[PDB]
Every structure is written in structure tokens, then in C-alpha cells.
Design a protein around this ligand. Sequence first.
Ligand SMILES: *[C@@H]1O[C@H](CO)[C@@H](O)[C@H](O)[C@H]1NC(C)=O
Ligand SMILES: *[C@@H]1O[C@H](CO)[C@@H](O)[C@H](O)[C@H]1NC(C)=O
Lengths: 190, 13, 180
Amino acid sequence: DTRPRFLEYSTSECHFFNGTERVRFLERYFHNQEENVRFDSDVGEYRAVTELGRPDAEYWNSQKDLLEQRRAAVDTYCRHNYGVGESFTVQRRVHPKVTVYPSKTQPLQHHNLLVCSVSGFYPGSIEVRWFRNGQEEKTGVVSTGLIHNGDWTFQTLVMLETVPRSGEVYTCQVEHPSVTSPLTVEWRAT
Amino acid sequence: GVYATRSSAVRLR
Amino acid sequence: EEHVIIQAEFYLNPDQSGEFMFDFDGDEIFHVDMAKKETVWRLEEFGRFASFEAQGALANIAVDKANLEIMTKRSNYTPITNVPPEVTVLTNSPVELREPNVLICFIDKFTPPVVNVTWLRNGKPVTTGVSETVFLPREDHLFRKFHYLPFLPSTEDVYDCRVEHWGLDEPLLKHWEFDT
Ligand SMILES: *[C@@H]1O[C@H](CO)[C@@H](O)[C@H](O)[C@H]1NC(C)=O
Ligand SMILES: *[C@@H]1O[C@H](CO)[C@@H](O)[C@H](O)[C@H]1NC(C)=O
């Protein structure tokens, strides 16, 4: 199918700061990936983003009932919907699963890569550090970055490039909002 | 609780 | 911000496809099944704590459809530019032989929101236990999508996520096999 496509897209966005103490509402209208008109509660009226949206900004700003709907949206829509799902979104906390396993930077190599897997957690904010014999390892650390699984869970792999010596103990340390104390997992060279 | 919809406005014809 | 809630909706011609969904900090809270005219919660448990009138979404889609017709005329029938997706295949947890796991196919940064996705096991299409998300919003207004395939890890099975998009010259295949 090589027929031309035409896409009409719109978002109604609620931005929350310090709980619901500060709230900003944005309604945005798009056509073929181009935003052409928006309402920003900071302004209180529609504004054209591009010339193609100018007729609608003017038309919509002439409708007092529409504007007052949008001006009240931070309360009737944003703060309301925030309250509706607060218990299972804002207060959602899922403990990370933490495991450590050895790997290789390339085949035909000795085990020279330590992988700290941190998975299944929520929210996405996480902090993972490596230690060797009680000292933080800041060099040779590479990671997948934060990975979203698309199902209200996240994961990450934090890897340490190192050459383990006999008797060395490596520790992966994890901080996450679901806990008030760091999680630690040890790995021992055989 | 019930999630509210922000109705969309119809562009100028 | 500390949190962001987004109601995202689109209507697409000539496919006549519409979608309505709520997003919380990047995750889907729910979408509306246009066919069944029903609310679909991303996690089953959400439905026990909250509700939503799907009829409100259908009304917005009707507006989006009307607005599309108006914009298409105004822009002189300028077609959307295809932006082909990036695809990543991964597991949701470290793989252990004979330990049940889930393959994830992440389709990202594309538009229009139309895609054909096929899971392949050893080159053969597999549909058992598969699932998928609707099209999810991005800050750059491109889309993302997740496909899932539960599986029993083995050394004798390889996997591919095959993705078709009008922005691609050929199907894009992302591979997975057991790591040594
Ligand atoms: C569409 O075509 C009309 C008629 O020629 C023209 O006046 C208008 O500027 C065009 N709009 C575009 C190219 O966005
Ligand atoms: C998906 O496959 C169908 C045929 O079943 C085809 O008509 C359609 O164009 C394909 N979509 C994409 C995005 O390739």
C-alpha cells in the first residue's frame, strides 16, 4: 500500500509539580507530525504554533465557553485524574530483582565482564554502582541505560570491565525509591 | 474514581 | 515535573484507524477498544481501582476524524512523511535454560502509527501466547509499540522480531539467541 496517509493527532497534557500544588495543562493539536495550535494554561488562550493553526486559535479563542472549560482544566481534569489513579501510579513501588553473573567482552576471552542485572522495578529512577573489596569502581563501567519494558516495569544491566583475581569479591549496589537502604549483591571469583 | 476525558475542539471548517 | 499524565488520540486516513489512550510517566494506563467500544486497562488490577466511560473517547475520535478532514483540505492534501522505526529485541529478565522468560520487541520512533509485527521461532511465524500494546506517545510525537512472546529458553531455538513499516524498503528483523 503506497497510498498517501493523513494523520490527525492530539494530546491533553497534565504536568504536576510538588504533588498537585503546582499544575500546568497543555492541549496540543497536530497534523502529520506538525503541531499547529495549542492551549497553555500559563497563557489562558489558544495560540497558533504554525500559520496552518491560526484559523483555529482565532476561532477557538472566540468561544468563551470553550476557553473557560480549558481554564478550569487544571482542577476539573488534571487534579481530578491525578487523584483518581494516585494509589496505583504515583504510589506504585516495585522492588528490583538484583543478580550478578560473569560475561565476556568477546568470545575466546576469559571472564572479563561482570554484569549486574537490575530488573522488574518501578518507578524508573535507579542508581547502580560497582565496588571491589569495599572500594567503588568508577572506571570501565558500561550500561544499557534505563530500559522500559512497556508494562509498568523497568530494567537495566550495569557492567564492569575487569580482570578478576583469585579471592576478589565484587559488589553491586542498588538504590531505588522502593527501599530506604541500598541493596547489595556479591560475586566471587573462583 | 472515574477518569475524565478533555473533550476535543472541532477546527474551523 | 514530578509526574505527567497525557491523554493521546489520533485518527488516520485512509486506514480509518483511531486510538485513544492515557499515559502516566511513559506507561499506558488504559486505551479504548474502538471495535468493542470498551475500556482496556494496561494492568488488569487497574480496573478494580478506577473506571472510565469509553463513550467519551468515541466522541473525541469523531472530532479527530472531523478535524482530519478539515486539515487535509487546508494543507492541500500533503501526505505524512514516513519515519521508519528502530527495533530492539530483549528479554525482561536474564535468561536461564528451561526457565520461563519473555521476549520483548520494542518498536520505536516511527510514524504513521501502522506496523506489521511477526514473531519468528527458527524462521517460522509463532502466535501462541503473543501479546502487544497499542501505539504509545513520545515527546517528539513519533510512536512506540511493544510486542511480547513468552518462551522456554533453549540452546536449539532462535528468535526474530520481524517489523514491516511503509518507511522501510524491506522488513526489519531483530534477532535473539541464547548467549554463552
Ligand atoms: C494550498 O493551496 C492554496 C491555493 O493555491 C494556497 O493559497 C495555500 O497557500 C496552500 N496552502 C499550503 C501550501 O499550505
Ligand atoms: C501489513 O500487511 C498487509 C497485508 O496483510 C498490507 O496490506 C499492509 O500494507 C501492511 N502494512 C505495513 C505497514 O506494511
